[PDB]
Amino acid sequence: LSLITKLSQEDGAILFPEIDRYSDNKQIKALTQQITKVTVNGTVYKDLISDSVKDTNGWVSNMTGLHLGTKAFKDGENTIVISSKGFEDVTITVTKKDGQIHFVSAKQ
Amino acid sequence: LSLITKLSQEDGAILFPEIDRYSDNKQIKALTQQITKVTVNGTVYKDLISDSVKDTNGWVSNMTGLHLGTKAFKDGENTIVISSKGFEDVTITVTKKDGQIHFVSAKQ
Amino acid sequence: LSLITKLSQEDGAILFPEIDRYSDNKQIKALTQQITKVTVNGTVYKDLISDSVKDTNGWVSNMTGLHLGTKAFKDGENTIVISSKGFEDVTITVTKKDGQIHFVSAKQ
Amino acid sequence: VHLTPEEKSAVTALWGKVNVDEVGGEALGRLLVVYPWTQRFFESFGDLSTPDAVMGNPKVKAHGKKVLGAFSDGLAHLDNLKGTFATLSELHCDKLHVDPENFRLLGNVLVCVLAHHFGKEFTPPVQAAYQKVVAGVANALAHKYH
Amino acid sequence: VHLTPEEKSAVTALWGKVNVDEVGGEALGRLLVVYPWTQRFFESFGDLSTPDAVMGNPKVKAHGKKVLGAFSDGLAHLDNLKGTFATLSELHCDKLHVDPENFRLLGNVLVCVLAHHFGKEFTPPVQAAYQKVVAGVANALAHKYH
Amino acid sequence: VLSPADKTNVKAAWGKVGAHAGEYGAEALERMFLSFPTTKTYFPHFDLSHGSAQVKGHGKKVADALTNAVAHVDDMPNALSALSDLHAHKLRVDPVNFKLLSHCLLVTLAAHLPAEFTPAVHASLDKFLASVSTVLTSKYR
Amino acid sequence: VLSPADKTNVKAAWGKVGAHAGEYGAEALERMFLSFPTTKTYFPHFDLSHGSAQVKGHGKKVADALTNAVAHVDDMPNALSALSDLHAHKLRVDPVNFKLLSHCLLVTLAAHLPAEFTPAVHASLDKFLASVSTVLTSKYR
Numbered sequence: 001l002s003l004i005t006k007l008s009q010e011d012g013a014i015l016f017p018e019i020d021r022y023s024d025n026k027q028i029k030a031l032t033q034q035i036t037k038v039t040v041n042g043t044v045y046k047d048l049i050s051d052s053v054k055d056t057n058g059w060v061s062n063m064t065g066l067h068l069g070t071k072a073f074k075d076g077e078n079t080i081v082i083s084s085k086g087f088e089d090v091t092i093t094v095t096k097k098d099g100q101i102h103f104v105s106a107k108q
Numbered sequence: 109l110s111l112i113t114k115l116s117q118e119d120g121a122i123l124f125p126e127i128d129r130y131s132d133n134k135q136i137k138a139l140t141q142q143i144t145k146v147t148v149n150g151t152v153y154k155d156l157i158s159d160s161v162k163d164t165n166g167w168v169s170n171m172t173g174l175h176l177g178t179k180a181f182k183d184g185e186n187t188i189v190i191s192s193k194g195f196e197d198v199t200i201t202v203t204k205k206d207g208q209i210h211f212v213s214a215k216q
Numbered sequence: 217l218s219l220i221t222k223l224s225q226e227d228g229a230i231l232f233p234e235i236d237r238y239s240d241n242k243q244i245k246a247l248t249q250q251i252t253k254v255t256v257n258g259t260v261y262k263d264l265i266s267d268s269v270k271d272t273n274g275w276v277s278n279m280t281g282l283h284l285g286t287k288a289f290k291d292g293e294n295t296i297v298i299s300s301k302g303f304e305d306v307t308i309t310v311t312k313k314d315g316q317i318h319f320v321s322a323k324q
Numbered sequence: 325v326h327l328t329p330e331e332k333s334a335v336t337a338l339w340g341k342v343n344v345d346e347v348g349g350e351a352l353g354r355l356l357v358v359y360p361w362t363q364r365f366f367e368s369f370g371d372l373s374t375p376d377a378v379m380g381n382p383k384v385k386a387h388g389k390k391v392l393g394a395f396s397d398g399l400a401h402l403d404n405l406k407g408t409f410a411t412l413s414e415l416h417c418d419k420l421h422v423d424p425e426n427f428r429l430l431g432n433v434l435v436c437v438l439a440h441h442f443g444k445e446f447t448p449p450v451q452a453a454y455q456k457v458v459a460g461v462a463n464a465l466a467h468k469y470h
Numbered sequence: 471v472h473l474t475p476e477e478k479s480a481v482t483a484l485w486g487k488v489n490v491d492e493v494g495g496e497a498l499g500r501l502l503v504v505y506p507w508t509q510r511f512f513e514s515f516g517d518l519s520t521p522d523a524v525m526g527n528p529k530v531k532a533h534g535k536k537v538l539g540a541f542s543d544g545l546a547h548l549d550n551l552k553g554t555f556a557t558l559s560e561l562h563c564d565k566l567h568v569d570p571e572n573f574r575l576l577g578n579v580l581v582c583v584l585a586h587h588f589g590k591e592f593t594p595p596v597q598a599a600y601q602k603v604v605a606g607v608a609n610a611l612a613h614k615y616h
Numbered sequence: 617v618l619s620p621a622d623k624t625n626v627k628a629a630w631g632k633v634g635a636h637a638g639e640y641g642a643e644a645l646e647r648m649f650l651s652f653p654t655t656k657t658y659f660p661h662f663d664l665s666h667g668s669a670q671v672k673g674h675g676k677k678v679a680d681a682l683t684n685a686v687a688h689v690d691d692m693p694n695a696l697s698a699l700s701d702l703h704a705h706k707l708r709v710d711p712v713n714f715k716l717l718s719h720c721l722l723v724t725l726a727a728h729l730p731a732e733f734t735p736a737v738h739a740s741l742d743k744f745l746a747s748v749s750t751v752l753t754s755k756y757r
Numbered sequence: 758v759l760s761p762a763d764k765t766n767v768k769a770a771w772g773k774v775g776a777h778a779g780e781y782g783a784e785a786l787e788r789m790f791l792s793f794p795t796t797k798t799y800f801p802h803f804d805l806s807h808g809s810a811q812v813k814g815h816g817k818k819v820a821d822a823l824t825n826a827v828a829h830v831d832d833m834p835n836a837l838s839a840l841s842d843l844h845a846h847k848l849r850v851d852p853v854n855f856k857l858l859s860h861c862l863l864v865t866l867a868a869h870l871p872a873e874f875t876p877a878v879h880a881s882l883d884k885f886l887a888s889v890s891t892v893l894t895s896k897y898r
């Protein structure tokens with residue numbers, strides 16, 4: 001996908017700025033709004049609504065992006081599967097190396 | 109008093125239009141507003157707030173005037189004493205004759 | 217009057233704080249609101265609405281008090297006569313001494 | 325309250341051509357006429373019984389100048405309305421007890437009067453400038469209510 | 471927004487007893503039912519056509535916690551609402567196009583819900599505290615509009 | 617105007633008020649006076665102290681006028697048309713105040729009617745009080 | 758409801774609009790869009806630029822609806838009943854917007870009718886536009 005490309009590191013969690021529920025891109029707005037399920041390395045994450053995601057199996061969509069807890073993040077390669085109502089699951093790939101997570105790919 | 113001068117008859121009660129709690133006459137307004145006690149022929153009347161005064165020992169100040177129940181009204185000469193924190197008791201005198209009350213006088 | 221007692225010295229004018237058009241004292245409020253004519257030592261002053269009174273034959277009623285220009289103010293004793301529809305003229309007396317005006321008395 | 329360069333210039337250029345004695349009186353005139361409940365506050369101004377009674381009542385024209393004059397301090401200090409109007413916010417709330425909703429109404433009537441005097445010159449952009457100024461004055465007078 | 475030391479104690483004592491899972495959703499639910507034009511903004515929530523549709527719709531309950539959560543920062547930071555809500559203000563105006571009048575409405579519905587849950591304990595003084603808090607939050611969200 | 621369904625809710629809920637009309641009326645005024653103190657000044661003569669006699673009196677006056685409008689629902693504009701002159705022509709009540717009192721009446725009704733103050737009923741009451749509001753300001757229109 | 762003289766003012770002043778209906782309609786929308794940009798978001802696909810063709814089109818549609826409601830001052834709720842369903846049930850237009858547009862209509866009327874926008878006529882028009890506003894939001898109440 002040409003639209004999901006980068007991420008940020010936070011306390012016990014990662015942020016996808018471009019997964020914006022208020023994005024001027026009608027498609028991104030609707031995808032983010034309709035997220036039914038997130039899996040990291042097969043583990044089912046929970047919608048924490050507005051709590052912190054610091055060291056949790058939890059996600060939050062808000063004005064800054066999609067926030068993901070790094071609890072179920074292993075060393076090396078990780079596989080994130082975001083599902084919504086009206087889109088094909090987005091599979092995101094990242095690399096934990098000495099406790100630093102770098103963006104790899106996001107494909108549909 | 110050349111301000112309390114007339115009355116009307118109602119169903120088991122009498123109305124003094126000019127005893128107006130919304131009167132442009134700041135004096136009448138304040139008197140009506142601060143009525144503490146009303147006596148007809150010695151009998152102490154009750155503030156009925158907004159109920160009917162039909163055949164009661166009750167008075168009501170509202171937008172149409174001061175409403176007085178004719179329960180404690182005898183035949184011939186009648187004496188009404190209105191007291192108000194504000195100023196001097198208002199004494200009204202009226203005449204019941206074949207069940208018809210005519211205004212006579214009002215004095216302080 | 218026990219109500220008008222002091223004044224303050226402003227640039228080319230004097231201020232009567234107690235002549236307050238927003239006074240909770242219904243009497244003072246109404247007097248100030250109905251000021252028809254002001255004379256200093258016989259000279260007729262003008263209502264300048266809300267301009268400055270600095271070195272004018274002008275008065276202004278506002279939230280700070282009654283503002284009087286010191287143009288028609290002579291050395292020694294001065295006599296200020298305030299007239300208002302409802303009330304009898306108020307005469308206020310003050311004393312200019314090498315450019316200091318101090319309060320004397322105010323009477324009806 | 326934040327205005328572009330072209331807007332601040334536009335406002336002051338139009339204000340400079342304004343009859344300070346006449347416009348204030350028509351604004352307050354039109355408030356007392358179009359929003360009749362506003363007469364409550366000014367019962368001490370004698371006769372407000374007809375449109376003409378109100379518009380030709382000297383106390384109205386007079387009060388108009390105080391109001392219009394006060395908008396002028398507003399235009400002098402747009403970066404400091406909150407402060408300029410403070411003692412006067414105190415007055416309208418603490419002593420007069422004016423519902424701030426009426427500040428927005430006067431302001432909008434003021435806009436109707438400018439459009440009435442300046443005809444085609446009261447362009448949509450010029451309005452949008454003056455709408456920001458008038459909401460600003462309204463906010464400032466409302467501050468010392470909370 | 472000035473509260474007496476009693477008002478502050480009163481507010482926090484009532485807030486402490488509030489179901490932060492439930493109350494925000496009853497407020498939002500009641501706004502969508504009482505003031506139907508508010509449905510415009512939340513058409514992405516699915517069916518809000520009936521009081522049942524609404525009070526049973528998880529997107530509402532969940533959104534209610536974000537709103538209740540937001541009032542919590544408000545109560546934490548009464549000295550600096552304008553700042554606490556600054557980013558939310560930009561969002562509601564610049565990105566949601568929501569008229570500030572609706573903030574006052576939600577806040578009044580929130581007050582109706584507290585009165586519904588707390589009965590006689592929601593005393594007139596405790597209301598007058600919460601009415602000041604809700605007018606305060608309404609103000610801060612409205613700031614970046616100006 | 618109110619749906620048949622709205623009228624049914626208003627009649628049912630105001631029914632439950634029963635003999636507390638005057639007390640609920642008085643509570644709402646007190647709720648208005650504390651929360652919106654600009655409202656105090658329409659009552660210069662009154663004692664506005666918590667247990668005030670005059671407030672309880674004016675609570676009855678208002679609550680009774682409402683009780684009346686709940687059984688004049690179709691006839692409301694005609695029922696309170698004298699009250700409509702009083703409030704506009706003489707008292708010069710600011711429209712804004714009808715919304716504050718209406719809010720305070722809902723807060724009161726909500727506080728006293730846990731078991732029937734459903735969303736559907738709160739809408740119906742909210743509308744109904746706006747109707748009374750609309751009639752009472754109608755001599756401005 | 759509108760006095761006989763309210764009607765007389767509204768009919769006389771709206772009369773003077775005549776064939777400028779479309780232009781005055783379009784000016785008011787543009788005045789609303791500049792002063793209250795919150796209103797622009799009801800027009801997602803419309804060209805809202807100065808001189809827009811769609812704005813002139815929508816200006817005519819509105820002005821014509823108003824011209825219509827002048828003829829039908831007496832039975833307004835019945836006159837614009839279909840428009841009332843559209844604006845409340847479909848578009849969910851926020852009541853607040855009807856006051857902004859109405860205000861911008863007076864600014865327009867005022868700007869274009871120096872000689873006939875008298876205080877008496879401004880009251881009459883202000884009321885009349887509030888009537889249109891009230892009917893247009895009447896599937897909320």
Ligand code: HEM
Pocket residue numbers: 021061062063064508511512533536537540541558562566568572573576577607608611
């Ligand atoms: C005090 C009043 C209010 C508060 C405290 C509040 C708070 C919030 C918060 C915290 C969010 C989520 C922000 C995020 O994702 O980071 C939000 C979103 C939103 N609010 Fe509000 N809000 C208020 C009033 C309103 C009103 C009155 C409306 C509409 C009438 C509204 C419509 C929305 C909408 C549409 C969203 C985005 C919905 C979504 O993405 O699912 N809000 N608000």
Ligand code: HEM
Pocket residue numbers: 129169170171172655658659677678679681682699702703707709713714717718748749752
């Ligand atoms: C919303 C429903 C309202 C109802 C049903 C209502 C009803 C009444 C009634 C029955 C009276 C007594 C009239 C008489 O003596 O004949 C009255 C008087 C009055 N109302 Fe209202 N009213 C309402 C709203 C308001 C509001 C919002 C205000 C002010 C904020 C207000 C201020 C007054 C005042 C000042 C009086 C006169 C008090 C006195 O005579 O001592 N009313 N109202």
Ligand code: HEM
Pocket residue numbers: 237266277278279280362365366387390391394395412415416420422426427430431461462465
């Ligand atoms: C932008 C809006 C307004 C401005 C700039 C404004 C300004 C002023 C000013 C400068 C004064 C004179 C105070 C003094 O110098 O002593 C004043 C007084 C007053 N204002 Fe306002 N005002 C505004 C809105 C309103 C509104 C909407 C009302 C509604 C009733 C109102 C009612 C009054 C009253 C009653 C007085 C005192 C009357 C008198 O003593 O002559 N004001 N205002």
Ligand code: HEM
Pocket residue numbers: 796799800818819820822823840843844848850854855858889890893
């Ligand atoms: C006096 C006030 C108003 C009048 C007379 C009026 C009249 C009309 C008319 C005649 C139509 C066309 C009907 C149709 O297409 O079938 C229309 C459509 C519409 N009106 Fe209004 N209207 C008014 C106020 C408003 C306001 C205040 C808004 C929004 C702020 C609004 C938003 C709309 C929208 C979004 C449409 C649909 C047009 C489109 O996008 O194609 N109206 N109006």
